[PDB]
Amino acid sequence: AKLETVTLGNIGKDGKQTLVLNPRGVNPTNGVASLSQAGAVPALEKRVTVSVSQPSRNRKNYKVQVKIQNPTACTANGSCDPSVTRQAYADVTFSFTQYSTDEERAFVRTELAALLASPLLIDAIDQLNPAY
């Protein structure tokens, strides 16, 4: 549907964190939409990117790419302006076949989320731990 303000509740380890994302427009070249938090400095502002794709002579498969960019502001650099320190990269992709059905895709969508809420990944993500 239409790019809109996207509010998000239940965020962060607390789950009391909330975030809104304004539509940033769409880069027509790569054909990729953009979403962002409204901050002060766009360089500091959180970014969310989604894209679709269509099969070509190069590839017969659909690609759905989602990337998230969350920098780390250094408030006091010893200078009057904050500066980017660390840049968190969150990337998600999807592949499908021209005959892919709806529920299959839908099935993929939820389960990925459930994993993200699974106690497995949290140690993997938060504490950077392998499967043991």
């Binding site: 269509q54 099969p55 070509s56 002579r57 021209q98 005959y99």
Partner: protein, 419 residues
């Protein structure tokens, strides 16, 4: 939202044009304004007055959005853009600069730009009485005028298949070991005998024997691609004629309480009917590229004839089998355009363009020199899609039947080159 206004699904998740909507669109009502406000640069009543006032008008025009999509036939022409336009008494933007000098104190100059008005124009007509007869007359001369090119290409494609039946013997000669038959074919190519006599490899002898043969096939497939596209343009038969006509109009009052303006505009009532000739069953299965493109055919043909290859240490035997397999696949793809070809789509587009006209100036009966120029913005565009003919006379099946079995024998020959 997965289905656009011009696309339809299928049984195998194929995106084809929706013929239900593409033939007859939906009439959309237009409520917006094109140019409701025009400006005046000049003087009147011996006083500087620059104001903006709306004139008469009204917005009732039925329009449909254009659609440009991929064709519905392999190696075919673009689909017709079916757009319905309802005439509302098309207005022309009046740009007229008039300069009058009379009296002793009554002198003013003002230019009225972008002044729209309404005339009386014929909304419908019919030219089929002079077009349909002339339409079937070109069919008789088509066999004499273009028949030479058709028969010439038929002889150039048959010789290609003959070369393909001969080179299969040299390839298999290395397989079982019959090298005696190889030396009989090589000697029938060169004028003299200069072949290498040094004892080399077993497969290296196939390269030397086919040296002139590689250059022969290269020239065949080169110019064939150009002639293949030349004959596709002849299938679209479109004929027409223009005739002169004059349209009279009156009741123009652009200069309120000063004068009236009249004139004459000459139009050209033209008509042309096009027809489409393609596969009857071709428009049932298609996707957004599934086939082998033709933009690289001119480059990929010389990729094997050149003495320089990158597959020598890459198992050439696998590349050779794949090369012939790709040739038969493309030949089978083009071979599906001659099986049964009949009239599939038809359309009749009528339009009236604009020509040079003249404008006469007058002020309540006095002659005055007036120089103006006008242009056309909207025109008649209604392409009515239908399938029917008043007197149908066409036969192209037997003419192209001789081309169908030629590629069939070639496609069945490559099936004997398996592993």
């Amino acid at each position: 939202p997965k289905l656009p206004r011009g696309l339809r699904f299928g049984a195998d998740n194929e995106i084809l044009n929706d013929f239900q909507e593409l033939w007859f669109p939906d009439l959309f009502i237009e409520s917006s304004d094109t140019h409701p406000w025009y400006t005046l640069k000049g003087r009147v009543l011996n006083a500087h007055l620059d104001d903006r006032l709306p004139n008469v008008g009204g917005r009732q025009v039925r329009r449909t959005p254009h659609r440009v999509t991929v064709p519905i036939a392999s190696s075919g022409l673009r689909p017709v853009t079916t757009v319905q336009y309802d005439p509302a008494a098309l207005s022309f933007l009046l740009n007229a600069r008039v300069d009058w000098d009379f009296g002793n104190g009554d002198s003013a100059n003002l230019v009225i730009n972008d002044f729209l008005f309404r005339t009386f124009a014929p909304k419908e007509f019919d030219f089929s009485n002079s077009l349909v007869p002339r339409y079937t007359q070109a069919f008789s001369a088509f066999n004499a005028k273009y028949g030479t090119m058709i028969g010439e290409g038929l002889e150039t494609i048959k010789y290609l298949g003959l070369l393909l039946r001969r080179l299969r013997e040299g390839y298999r000669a290395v397989k079982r070991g019959d090298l005696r038959a190889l030396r009989r074919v090589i000697q029938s190519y060169h004028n003299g005998k200069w072949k290498p006599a040094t004892a080399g490899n077993l497969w290296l002898e196939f390269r030397y024997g086919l040296m002139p043969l590689f250059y022969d096939i290269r020239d065949v497939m080169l110019d064939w691609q150009n002639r293949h596209d030349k004959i596709q343009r002849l299938l679209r038969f479109s004929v027409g004629h223009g005739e002169d006509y004059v349209v009279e109009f009156d009741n123009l009052y652009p200069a309120v309480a000063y004068f009236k303006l009249k004139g004459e505009i000459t139009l050209e009532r033209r008509h042309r009917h096009g027809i489409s000739y393609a596969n009857r069953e071709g428009y049932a299965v298609f996707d957004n590229g599934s086939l082998r493109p033709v933009s690289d055919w001119k480059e990929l043909a010389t990729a094997f004839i050149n003495p320089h290859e990158v597959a020598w240490e890459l198992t050439p035997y696998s590349f050779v089998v794949d090369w012939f397999l790709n040739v038969g696949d493309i030949l089978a793809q083009q071979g599906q355009l001659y099986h049964n070809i009949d009239i599939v789509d038809g359309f009749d587009r009528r339009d009236i363009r604009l020509k040079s006209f003249t404008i006469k100036g007058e002020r309540n009966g006095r002659p005055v020199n007036v120089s103006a120029s006008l242009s056309a913005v909207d025109l008649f565009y209604s392409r009515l899609h239908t399938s029917n003919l008043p007197f149908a006379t066409l036969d192209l099946d037997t003419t192209f039947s001789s081309f169908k079995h030629v590629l069939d024998s070639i496609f069945l020959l490559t099936q004997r080159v398996k592993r």
